Structures are given as C-alpha cells and as structure tokens.
Design a protein around this nucleic acid. Structure first.
Length: 151
RNA sequence: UAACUUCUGUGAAGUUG
C-alpha cells in the first residue's frame, strides 16, 4: 500500500473501534486536559471527564464535542490507561493509572495503542509516516521507532 | 479520517448526511 492507503486504512481501523485521532494539535490538547482532570487521582465518570475536556476545547476547536472527545477517551480506555471502579446500578468511576499520570507516559501509551491498532489491521507504517500522522512533523521518528520496537 | 446524540462500553445503538 501507498502512504495514502495506509493512512485511510489506519483511520478506518481506529474508527471501527469507537476511537478517533482528531489531528496532532487537538489530540495533544485533549490529552493534556485529561491529565489536568486526572493527574491528582480524581475519580470521574466517563461523562464528567468528557465534559471537563470538551468545555475547555470548544473555544479553540470547532471539532470539539461530547462525541469527538468521547472517541479520544475510548482510545485511552482501550489502551488500559484507566483504573475503573464499578458501582452497583450506577456509572463507573475512572482514574488514570499512576504510571500514566504524566504527559510523556500518557502520550506514549496513546501512541502505542494506535500503532497496536495498525498491527491488528495488518498495516506496516514507517516511523517517518507515524511521525507525520501523529505529530504533523518528521521530528518524532525516534519516538515512534521506540514504540514500534517495544510492541 | 462523515457529523452529532445516548450509554457503566478493550465498545454498542440511534438521528442526520
């Protein structure tokens, strides 16, 4: 496959899982807001986490909605980033696992989950293309290479 | 990379196009 087919097939696979990558700038800001809410160990319902993030992104990002931010939260959920507390007959509460309570750690797990989805879908994407896809530059090749090699 | 809505989702369904 050419780069364009790889990209389209990747986002199809991500979306098929109820997840979304919103673009490099917006995704970064969304993840920073998840941290802002959860880095201190607060236990939020999925609904309240999404509200926290959406409200802060809406001024800058017309893409921001409960739907689009929900997709980002789902990506982190699928990546096992949350300690989930079940409550009988009620909404579960979510905390960030202690190991993911910094941007570097959370972002790495996020990126690894998208690479994992690519692998699930049979897509072989170079570190160069990964850097472009997830960061909009070619400066994150070594980072993506590390993720690929640890997967 | 269809948008949105509901939902306790390693995910579902619905509305619109």
């Amino acid at each position: 496959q050419n780069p364009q087919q790889l990209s389209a097939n990747l986002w199809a696979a991500v979306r098929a899982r109820g997840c979304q990558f919103l673009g490099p700038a917006m995704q970064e800001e969304a993840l920073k807001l998840v941290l802002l809410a959860l880095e201190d160990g607060s236990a939020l319902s999925r609904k309240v986490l999404v509200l926290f993030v959406v409200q802060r992104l809406e001024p800058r990002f017309p893409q921001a909605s409960k739907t689009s931010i929900g997709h980002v939260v789902q990506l982190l959920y699928r990546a096992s980033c949350f300690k989930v507390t079940k409550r009988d007959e009620d909404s579960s509460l979510m905390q960030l696992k202690e190991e993911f309570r910094s941007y570097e750690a959370l972002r790495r797990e996020h990126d690894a989950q998208i690479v994992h989805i690519a692998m699930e879908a049979g897509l072989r994407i170079s570190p160069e293309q990964w850097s472009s896809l997830l960061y909009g530059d070619l400066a994150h090749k070594s980072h993506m290479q590390s993720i690929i090699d640890k997967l």
